Design a protein around this ligand. Structure first.
Ligand code: ADP
Ligand code: ADP
Ligand code: MG
Ligand code: MG
Lengths: 353, 351
């Protein structure tokens, strides 16, 4: 029950988004972490719309291919749902109950506290401690989402021969990987108020963290796909080619002047406005750092541009800066893909919780 | 179900109980970095812990109560350890298709066949390794068992102080955990080292490669032998002698007691370390790490290094760690080599 007579582990960090699937495997010896494997597999179009999986078979195939590229034997994974699909409430329950009695009361009365219909609820709970109002009672934390969100991921992973050991929340994954960034920035958490800007292909999310803890969160429909869509149109290229054009280069001379710079400015506008909301909605007046995450954060000197326009220290996220690397992992490819792997990193970090 | 992590989140006190003292250590984690939140050392009443066994139960709880007050921690959950000598470890072949709880029961019936302890008095930990290569229809299950009394007496002791053992670890595993932090000092992956822990009533030798223990030996030699010589020469109590040893005695001391005793150490070190090269593949140890309270003797590391021609270092797991405000940086450094076990126990929080 309590025996640690055996010394034991790790779980695959699998980030499923609208456009791709990212896999990351970590290990640790003593204090410091090491990257055992990573890979990225693009998704078929419309396989995932917004945050919703639709082509269940499509995601499965991608997960199968991402395992082959990653070359890992691990079959357990941490996946995440969006925080927007999670309802969190604190309620009072009677103290002195077993876990079963506790689960019965919650399963029965879930609908009383959460908007979702009883049959569709997937609820996680945690006893916080004795209630301050009445010592005869305890405060219990509730977090619930529609069961369908969990079940589609189970089914998707199962097709690739993987299992979802933990269903996480994206915001939590971000925190765990942010905590590793400390070195790069400060280092110390030091009440560092940091704006993490995740610029995905279709979605951009601002998350402000105080001393390692998420506070503000908001999301705009801004993304790197708009850059891709512009590259497609000007040069007559498919979505596949446009994405490749951004990293590979090769596009003619007018690209920087006509396409990339206007997109960069749009990125700056989006970041600026997003940051305005946060200062307005709290006691915080400024942030110590801005951290750029997502694939679009790899755009050359995007950090410098944001830095000059806003006046706030801005850097591209690299959680793997102080990490050891497996010989199978290419340092160049990982470094170029580092900001897009913040979620995948945080998911893998759940293994060490 | 158990799958769910819609809610996010637990640190445990490292409680090292030896023959002479109780040592507490509390760690916190920020990303990869470790921070020392609290620590304290409390002497034990004599004959409260003999060898590796707790005899005077209330005496330990009292020491635990007082070590809590000194450390000033709010934590009530802890990790304690049993000696590896009380732990039997073996891999057996079991039937496949049995659930975890199902397996727990069948272990009871089969325990009798493979573990030395009586059925009624055995505590068993197990882990499924995977399918058996001998027969795929069966699975390999790792077993680790100790007499239940070892677990029960420590629970009862912690309970007298209002603490609870969340995990019953093994000393050797704790040493490993703590030793991997050393590597940062030695640089950088630990890659073979011998760890010499010199306690009050006992000295223990262990060797580690790329982060893993390989060898173990022990002897009744310790700093108490030094204390006892001090007691006799100047008619001072064990408390006085131990205090005088750290505080610093008539000039006579250095030549008549201190120097001989160091000589007694280096010989006891020399004999023990010879067997490892004799009983294994490895022919050279890269470094000797001194641990235990007696390892804090000035220039003892250097004296051992010369006589054995092997790089010698005094352990300090907290070298790269951050410190909480209430922790004294100076006192911790002085006590660091004696806190390797307590440190390793606290690290189990993050395991
Ligand atoms: N090196 C790069 N330079 C510019 N854009 C990139 C680079 N790498 C990836 N991107 C862009 O990032 C977008 C997706 O990033 P990512 O955040 O990983 O996906 P998601 O939005 O699903 O989280 C894609 O539109 C891609 O064009
Ligand atoms: N600074 C020091 N200088 C010399 N001897 C010390 C010092 N600190 C502790 N000791 C000796 O080390 C012994 C403590 O051993 P320790 O490893 O803490 O106990 P245990 O055997 O329970 O692990 C005491 O007998 C003490 O005499
Ligand atoms: Mg994303
Ligand atoms: Mg000891």
């Amino acid at each position: 029950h309590m025996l640690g007579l055996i010394k034991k582990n790790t779980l695959l960090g699998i980030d499923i988004s609208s456009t791709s699937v990212k896999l990351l495997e970590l290990s640790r010896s003593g204090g410091r972490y090491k990257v055992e494997a990573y890979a990225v597999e693009p998704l078929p179009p419309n396989a995932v719309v917004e945050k919703n999986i639709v082509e269940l078979e499509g995601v499965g195939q991608a997960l199968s291919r991402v395992l082959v590229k990653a070359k890992t034997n691990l079959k357990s994974a941490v996946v995440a749902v969006a925080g927007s699909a999670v309802i969190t409430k604190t309620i009072e329950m009677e103290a002195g109950l077993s876990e079963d009695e506790l689960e019965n009361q919650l399963k029965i009365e879930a609908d009383q506290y959460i908007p979702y219909p009883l049959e569709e609820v997937a609820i996680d709970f945690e006893v916080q401690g004795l209630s301050a109002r009445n010592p005869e009672r305890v405060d219990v934390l509730l977090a619930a989402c529609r069961k369908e969100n969990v079940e589609v991921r189970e089914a998707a992973l199962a097709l690739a021969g993987l299992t979802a050991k933990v269903v996480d929340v994206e915001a939590y994954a971000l925190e765990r990987s942010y905590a590793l960034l400390s070195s790069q920035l400060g280092a110390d958490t030091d009440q560092l108020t940091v704006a993490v800007v995740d610029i995905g292909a279709t979605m951009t999310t601002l998350s402000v963290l105080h001393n390692g803890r998420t506070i503000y969160t908001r999301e705009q429909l801004f993304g790197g796909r708009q850059l891709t869509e512009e590259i497609q149109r000007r040069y007559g290229l498919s979505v596949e080619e446009a994405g490749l054009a951004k990293k590979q280069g090769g596009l003619p001379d007018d690209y920087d002047s006509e396409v990339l710079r206007p997109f960069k400015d749009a990125v700056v506008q989006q970041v600026s406005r997003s940051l305005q909301f946060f200062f307005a909605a709290g006691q915080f007046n400024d942030v110590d750092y801005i951290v750029l995450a997502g694939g679009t954060a790899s755009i050359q000197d995007l950090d410098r541009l944001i830095q000059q326009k806003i006046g706030t220290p801005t850097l591209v996220a690299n959680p793997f800066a102080d990490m050891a690397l497996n010989g199978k992992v290419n340092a160049g490819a990982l470094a170029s893909d580092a900001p897009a792997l913040m979620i995948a990193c945080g998911l893998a970090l759940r293994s060490f919780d």
